[PDB]
Paper text:
Crystals of His6-tagged aPGM5 belong to space group P21, while crystals of His6-tagged bPGM5 belong to space group P21212, both with one molecule in the asymmetric unit. The aPGM5 structure consists of residues 4–567, except for residues 511–513. Despite crystallization of aPGM5 in a condition without divalent ions, a metal ion is observed in the active site, coordinated at around 2.4 Å distance by Asp292, Asp294, and Asp296 in loop 2. Due to the long coordination distances, the ion was modelled as calcium rather than magnesium. In aPGM5, Ser121 is unphosphorylated, suggesting that the phosphorylation state is batch-dependent. Interestingly, Val330 is involved in a crystal contact in bPGM5, but the corresponding interface is not formed in the structure of aPGM5. The structures of aPGM5 and bPGM5 are overall very similar and even the backbone conformations at the mutation site are essentially identical.
PGM5 shows a bi-lobed structure with four domains arranged around a common active site, forming a deep cleft between domains I–II (residues 1–195 and 196–308) and domains III–IV (residues 309–425 and 426–567). As expected, all four domains contribute to the active site with one loop per domain; loop 1 (residues 119–126), loop 2 (residues 292–297), loop 3 (residues 379–384), and loop 4 (residues 507–520). Herring PGM5 binds substrate similarly to PGM1, but lacks enzymatic activity.
Author numbering: 4 to 510, 514 to 567
Write the structure that this text describes.
């Protein structure tokens, strides 16, 4: 009754370079470009050491987008033919990125494959992605990234078990006897929320949260899963377990196309939530991305909690959470483009702060060496060492726990925080799908100016606002664990007037330039100012000095947050 192992001849693709958040292509590429999915999967598998690959376990999940159930079928076939012993898969293929990280860590899997494009639309016309996480549970480190690219560039063949078929609909085991293999290749379809839920039980006070979402004084919340993966997570956790009304759950039926909407939590694409939070009926609002790792939070009347502020506010109030009461707090970390608001909190409560490059994987070594307990990014990301990924619902539960302890509302906390520590006005401009070449020459020409020998003695004037350059360079990071240096991680112009400008280049299939602007103000009276007025100038400096409009032929940013 054996299942044969078939080796297929193939020719390599040149574009299979995995980005900071996996390999993202239009669904057509994976679905029609022959041997494209197989080539990449085999590459991911070959990056695993040959010795360690035998009999090991991997976790597989998706956000439910179109082509996921087909990608998983190929994943189990190629996994079996490559010696993997067991695959843990989510019911119906549904497993959020935080849950995948939690499973990898619990059962001590060698890694996990996540089918998702995070903030990108899904469906036959939409996009598709493949993320690969390693043993510690976080995203693949740079070493693995290069290894995958190297293999993908030289792949001549791949192994697969085409005669293998799997049913995700019913939970349990599905043993397969492979040829020339004693132990049966196992496949475990597990509950999508159970293991992840039990992790949260040990972190938070579910009684405290349950009481806030219950009673005459109950909090009225609207949680928008955007028809992604987090639908069943909020329904089973927030509603069923924590007692929130059913109407609190919105767009919680995972759809292949996300109902035809973008799952990008922010003031631009989560308009469905902002409209309701503008009505004024709800005291708390939250939206998740497709895979459930990013999260936007809104107060009453659509009070926008800036993710950099969200990270600092939470840091300042971690005592409300049992997890950090017991284990304490060993350090904070933030990506470099994230505002220095957390730095304020840390210098106050005497805790270390690490300024890492953009990308959650750079948080792995800090947590694995006990140097960091809590971290986040301006990119709507936050998390702790309960796993090694950013966790959306963890952020909501964190905020609900701080609200039940403070006995206040969202805006009350944030403004109180501003009074005690000052406000870090912050915003980000995104220029998506711009010509990759122009984006490149824009960034090195700009670096050439930033790097000039006399640039630090330059002053920029917008009306009566003057910004004097203090230090500017191309960001560089030295890993404190292995001592490896990460370069070209974002240009920086630090002015000696409590302000920063950051320029970051990341990956039609074109480039994306993001411009971050930060300005700090001490006086609480000037904390009511409009961010557009505080940050308006800084951007004007950034636009003239970068000349991004003329260089890219764009008239405005694709997105503002
Ligand atoms: Ca994501
Ligand atoms: Na992502």
């Amino acid at each position: 009754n054996p299942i044969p192992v078939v080796t297929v001849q193939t020719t390599p693709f040149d574009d299979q370079k995995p980005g900071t958040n996996g390999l993202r292509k239009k669904t057509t590429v994976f679905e029609s470009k022959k041997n494209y999915l197989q080539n990449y999967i085999q590459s991911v598998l070959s990056s695993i050491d040959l010795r360690d690959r035998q009999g090991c376990t991997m976790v597989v999940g998706s956000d439910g987008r179109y082509f996921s159930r087909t990608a998983i079928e190929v994943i189990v076939q190629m996994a079996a033919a490559n010696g993997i012993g067991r695959l843990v898969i989510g019911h119906n293929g549904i497993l959020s990125t935080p849950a995948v990280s939690c499973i990898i860590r619990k059962i001590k899997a060698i890694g996990g494959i996540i089918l998702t494009a995070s903030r990108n639309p899904g469906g036959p016309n939409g996009d598709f992605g493949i993320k690969f996480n390693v043993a510690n549970g976080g995203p693949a480190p740079d070493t693995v990234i290069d290894k995958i690219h190297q293999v993908s560039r030289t792949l001549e063949e791949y192994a697969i078990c085409p005669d293998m078929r799997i049913d995700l609909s019913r939970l349990g085991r599905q043993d397969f006897d492979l040829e020339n293999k004693f132990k049966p290749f196992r496949v475990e379809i597990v509950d999508s929320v159970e293991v992840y839920l039990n992790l949260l039980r040990g972190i938070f006070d579910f009684n405290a949260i349950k009481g806030l979402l219950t009673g005459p004084d109950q909090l009225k919340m609207r949680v928008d899963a955007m028809s992604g993966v987090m639908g069943p997570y909020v329904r089973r956790i927030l509603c069923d377990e924590l007692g929130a009304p059913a109407n609190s759950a919105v767009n919680c039926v995972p759809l292949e196309d996300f109902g035809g909407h973008y799952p990008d939590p922010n003031l631009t694409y989560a308009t469905g939530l902002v409209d309701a939070m503008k009505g004024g009926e709800f005291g708390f609002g939250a939206a998740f991305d497709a895979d459930g790792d990013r999260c936007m939070i809104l107060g009453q009347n659509a009070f926008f909690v800036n993710p950099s502020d969200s990270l600092a506010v939470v840091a300042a109030n971690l005592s409300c959470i049992p997890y950090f009461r017991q284990a304490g707090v060993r350090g904070f970390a933030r990506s470099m483009p994230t505002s220095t608001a957390i730095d304020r909190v840390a210098k106050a409560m005497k805790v270390a702060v690490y300024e890492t490059p953009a990308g959650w994987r750079f948080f792995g070594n800090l947590m694995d060496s006990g140097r960091c307990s809590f971290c986040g990014e301006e990119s709507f990301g936050m998390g702790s060492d309960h796993i090694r990924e950013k966790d959306g619902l963890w952020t909501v539960l964190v905020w609900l726990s701080i609200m039940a302890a403070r006995k206040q509302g969202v805006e009350d906390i944030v403004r109180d925080h501003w009074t005690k520590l000052g406000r870090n006005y912050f915003c980000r401009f995104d220029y998506e799908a711009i010509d990759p070449r122009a984006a490149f020459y824009l960034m090195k020409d700009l670096e050439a100016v930033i790097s000039d020998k006399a640039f630090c003695s330059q002053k920029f004037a917008v009306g009566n606002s003057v910004y004097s350059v203090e230090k500017a360079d191309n960001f560089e990071y030295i890993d404190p664990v292995d001592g490896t240096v990460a370069r070209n991680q974002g240009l920086r112009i630090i002015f000696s007037e409590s302000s920063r400008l950051i320029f970051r280049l990341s990956g039609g299939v074109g480039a994306t330039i993001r411009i971050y602007a930060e300005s700090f103000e001490r006086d609480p009276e000037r904390h009511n100012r409009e961010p557009q007025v505080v940050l308006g100038p800084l951007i004007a400096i950034a636009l003239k000095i970068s000349d991004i409009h003329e260089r890219t032929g764009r008239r405005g940013p694709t997105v503002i947050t």
